Amino acid sequence: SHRKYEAPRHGHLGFLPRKRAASIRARVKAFPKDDRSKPVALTSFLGYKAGMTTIVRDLDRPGSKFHKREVVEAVTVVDTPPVVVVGVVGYVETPRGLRSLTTVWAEHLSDEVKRRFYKNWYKSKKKAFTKYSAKYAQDGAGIERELARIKKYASVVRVLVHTQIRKTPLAQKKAHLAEIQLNGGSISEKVDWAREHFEKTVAVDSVFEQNEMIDAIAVTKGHGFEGVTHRWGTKKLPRKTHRGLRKVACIGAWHPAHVMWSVARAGQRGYHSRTSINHKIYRVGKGDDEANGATSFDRTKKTITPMGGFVHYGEIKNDFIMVKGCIPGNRKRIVTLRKSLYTNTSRKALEEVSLKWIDTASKFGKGRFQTPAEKHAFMGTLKKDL
Template identity: 75%
Template sequence: MVRYGYTKTRRLKQNLQPACGKRGNFISHRHPTFVVQRSATSSTTARFLKMSHRKYEAPRHGSLGFLPRKRAARHRGKVKSFPKDDPKKPVHLTAVMGYKAGMTHVVRDLDRPGSKMHKREVVEAVTIIETPPLIVVGVVGYVETPRGLRTLTTVWASHLSDELKRRFYKNWYRSKKKAFTRYAKKHAEDGGKSIARELERIRKYCTVVRVLAHTQIRKTGLAQKKAHLMEIQVNGGSVADKVEFAQGLFEKPVEVSSVFEQDEVIDVIAVTKGHGFEGVTHRWGTKKLPRKTHKGLRKVACIGAWHPSKVMFSVARAGQNGYHHRTELNKKIYRIGLGSDEGNASTESDVTNKQITPMGGFPHYGIVKNDYLMLKGSIPGTKKRVITLRKSLMVHTSRRDLEKVQLKFVDTSSKFGHGAFQTQDEKKAFLGTLKARD
């Protein structure tokens, strides 16, 4: 190893040899790579000394699997594939909708043999989704074609609520509110024979049956009055059983507890939080350039070769960030809480009579008044966003997915930072009646 001292440096400069036989291509001692000749008598060895302040290769920044990164076409998450149908299973629905309220944390004992935390307490983040009962208002039949599924017919219920009819109008206030008035007469004419005829066509020709269901958004604390409508596939049993099941649900509420179970692993479909037009450093996570870089640091220095004379699709560029349609798999249900239960946040270890709504309400959402789902971890979307919850597409057999969750504590303290009190009574007992009013 060459040591850089005064005499060593002079000797090193004298022993520098050109990399090739031309004088004009002499390699300077300041170049990151040069050749050192030890002596004329010893064997000539070439050593390459490189600067180590940066790498010359690195993995790309950001995934190309989600292109194009543009705004979602619809506000509600769309189910692009439902679970595979099994006629041997009983007839059941495969999805519901809810509204994201916020997050909190829970304490539980981990049941995972082999883990260092086995039989020990762990603190985990959870998301609360308010799920008021859905109302089934129709049924759709699909036939299989060489180009995929095609709608054969749609049958609607006789009575539809105004919050659903608002979905079919851009301006409900100025409209005549005549939607479905003519269709409702079909249920009364001839004893509803035309409706029965359409249902018989579904039984005879269709292979896939889906119900039309909408949320009861008026039961939440949201200001919006327009309900969200979606198709939910009916799985299990024969086609005749599916049609009978769907017809029996007309104008009836569907509780979330009738679709999902505790400890079940489900999928979440939603539109992420929007951030507008963002630069390349925030959008793709590219490295900032050095401090003295001309015309900015938060840029990509090289956006491609001279030819082909275009910017490739894989090059990170500025643009829309967020408000993308995303599907997150394998979210475990920690609890299905009832809105009518005054102690729907209590546990066997924490018998305090408290509800899931934290002190002061969920920030930017308010009070959870209806049934709710408690899912492990975070989910896409901002507060108040409609969330589509779907049964998992795969069969789960791992010990982690089949683990039985037993909660010991659910945090209901203020999410706005005003103390760690779990209930109003606890705050009064600690601070006093007059001070607790603040």
């Protein structure tokens, strides 16, 4: 008989299976549609989630109860040092989909990216790309032949880039290598851009700008095996329930005489690939710019790094992307920031945000001070120093 009281199902069947992602770096499964009139540019970027903080800004939203008023907003900081271009892949269209025709690599690959090709780097003889780099012996005839093939074919061009983890506080030391689609016309010009940028760095400001809507693609934080109550949000069973209450009472009707795929079951929670869209960039800050965390309203000469450092991450010393709100993945995780797949004109996008103040109080507690100078000014002289 019927359910006797209607209620929406628990969870989204489109995010199935709730299994562990096959990689710690979530795949970009779609790049922006290519507009072959614009200049050649990366469609995405690689960064590392540093942490969260809060900003204050005046809201520019006519008709709102908070128009021209100050609002406090959570922001996520993504450490984004320049990525190194080390390769270029050509993709030909086939009746079976896109197929990589060939890949041309840079002549010199740094140990950062060479470590990606090894499970035991320290005891290896580090032979990776040693025979390939000889293809640049005298004139690079083989390299130019492969690039000519990419131009003659390969309706889609993607560059191979890798992060510079040595510039992050992470202990990993093994770089993240990814394909980023080159948008901007003239497949020939895409290949020329890739070849010229071989062994060269691309900074995050050449890809993203202030107020832009971007998408964050990352593997969520892992939580291991989870019961249905927190994995799917099902109702806790009553206290009187024998055999436990963090369960789904009826996992199926008599017929079909099978548990169905749509029934909440205990299993892995977290560590899933997610692609969350429409996160507005609030800052495109630069590592070389001391007073990274300053605004035109604050002027306090401070970097984005909170007092004591980003908890479990470290200090931001590179270029960084501050997006509004939160993004999937935990701190220290590699994230991919990609340009929006559509042209959003909604007055939520297209809003020009100007930060008034960025919180740099310690996130290791109820941080009361923005700067060590401010802590000294409030507390006066202490016994050890100050």
